[PDB]
Amino acid sequence: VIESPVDVVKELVENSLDAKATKVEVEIVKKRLIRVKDNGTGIHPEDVEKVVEALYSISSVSKFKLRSRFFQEKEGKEIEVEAGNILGTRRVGMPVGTEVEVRDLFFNLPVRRKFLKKEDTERRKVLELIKEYALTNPEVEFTLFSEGRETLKLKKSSLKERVEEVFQTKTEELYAEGITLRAFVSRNQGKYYVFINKRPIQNKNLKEFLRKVFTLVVLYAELPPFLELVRELAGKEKPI
């Protein structure tokens, strides 16, 4: 579950969205620090200690803090853990929501730490991950700071606006329908994103076929628990 900083960011941002955050803020350093802040419902003080599953596995491999203020409470609570060992808790003043800081990832596993990829490779994986969450959560604001610079800022918007902000280009929206397809295509620019029932799909069979029938292609597929309709979809661009 936890091999590198991107895996940490994934689990934390998933937890923020699970807690119906509308603003998710991520900061990474070098790794050295992963911080995820959200304005979701928070965690009751009586449950903060319990959560140390994904947070257990993260806290046992880092110098870990989690602070959270429950929507019903005036104060937050903070728990601090090192490599799975609880170091203490504290009352803290904070806004409603949750902030998790993961420091010195794999400090307790120096071989695993020395085999991590260079900072710039880890950075790009976290950048791509946050783009992927932003593409399926257009109602959510996302910010990413890396090495102290605000490298990604996406405000709440329509899906088409959110696609266009992410990829910095104008798109044409295509549609074809128990099976539903919605794509956004931009032709000059090649990148082929696929979301099946709101989840990111990396399948090679699908990206090659999007390459073959289209270019930037962002495909949102909704299916009950195909490639024909995609090529049917590819013919639906307006004449000009």
Ligand X SMILES: Nc1ncnc2c1ncn2[C@@H]1O[C@H](COP(=O)(O)OP(=O)(O)O)[C@@H](O)[C@H]1O
Q: Could you list the residues that contact Mg ion (CB under 5 A)?
A: 15, 54
Measured over the CA atoms of residue 207, residue 116, residue 56 and residue 127, the dihedral's sign is: negative
55 binds ligand X (CB under 6 A): yes
Closest approach, Cβ 187 to ligand X, in A, equals 39
Question: By C-beta, is 79 or 194 nearer to ligand X?
Answer: 79
Give Cα 92 to chain centroid, integer Å: 27
11 binds ligand X (CB under 6 A): yes
Among 43, 183, 194, 206, binds ligand X (CB under 6 A): 43
Among 2, 5, 31, 38, binds ligand X (CB under 6 A): 38
- The option from Mg ion, ligand X, none interacting with 138 (CB < 5 to 8 A, set by class) reads none
Closest approach, Cβ 79 to ligand X, in A, equals 11
For residues 200 and 195, give the distance between their C-alpha atoms in angstroms, rounded to a whole number: 4
62 binds ligand X (CB under 6 A): no
15 binds ligand X (CB under 6 A): yes
Question: By C-beta, is 15 or 41 nearer to Mg ion?
Answer: 15
Residues within the interface to ligand X (CB under 6 A) = 11, 15-16, 18-19, 38, 40-43, 51, 53-55, 98
